[PDB]
Amino acid sequence: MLTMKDIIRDGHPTLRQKAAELELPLTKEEKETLIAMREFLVNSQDEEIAKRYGLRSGVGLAAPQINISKRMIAVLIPDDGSGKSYDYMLVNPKIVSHSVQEAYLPTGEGCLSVDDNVAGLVHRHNRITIKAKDIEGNDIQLRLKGYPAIVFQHEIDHLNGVMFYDHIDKNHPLQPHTDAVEV
Template identity: 35%
Template sequence: MTKDDIIALPNPHLRQKSAKIHVITDEVRQLSANMIAAALDWEDSRPHEISAALAAIQVDHLERIIIVRSDFDDKATREFTTLINPEIVKYEGEIVADFEGCLSVKHVYGKVPRHSKIRVKALDLDGNEIRLKAEGFLARVIQHEIDHTNGIVFIDHIRDQHDAFYTLDDSGELQPLDYEADIKDNAQLWD
């Protein structure tokens, strides 16, 4: 897969819930590999961004699979961890609003409130149960991707539309967007 296989709003599939995976097959393992290839291809086309994670729905597969980058700080580390049927079993810490973007929401970033710590259970590609604690940016990324498996996109969490939406300028800096002028009535942002 390539970046061209990543679907974006207003594609209605992004609003559907993904199905639980009952048997981990070679097709599931191949889907994970394809998702990693698409995420890295997208990243290679973006000078100022990394591909932190991706959910299967973003490549138009309604299955509960997410991939999460192993190292968010080093773009040269191109490894991902696959989580199958990921589920948050406990929310902890405080609610923190911070910037998020999404490969399926083109050109728009926003401040999203998320829990600072979570506990997650999932399966790995061999069918083994994984339990992990995540905090900070990793917790935010996992919450974002699990939302995708439930048909939720990060912009759904933004309540205050003033000073909430941003875009990247040519130097990679976030610049505020005006909700009424730049987002609400601007279909080209969603194309």
């Protein structure tokens, strides 16, 4: 199983590289890591499991974060009363379309590869349409908005060598953009 020691930290050259496109079908090994990535997410969200292994709860993981420079991500956004949840292991994900309108998490964002809390607002597109392939090479189209759009943008950013704090305005780090929806 993947643990915290497998997670590389900010400073590692791999987190700043542009991850490589995957050929399809995936190799047996690429399928296993993606499954292991999703499983790490499932474990981290379980209070008991997370406590036994000391995992930080998270809803997204990108391959570069476990030192694998390939374009694959795992997104596991739980429900918590709404009836809307997301569980995806995607390959070669790309935002094909998106709004001009922004959205942001009021408390900013965190990242398993960044050990210290960085303050500031991360304005992302409020709505996005994504294209990707799943673990079997099947096509996936997803239309997302709000929090789920933000999670996916954070993960895709990792494939391009972008960190959440790259989006923080250094002069006015905490000023919300006009017409940006708070999530």
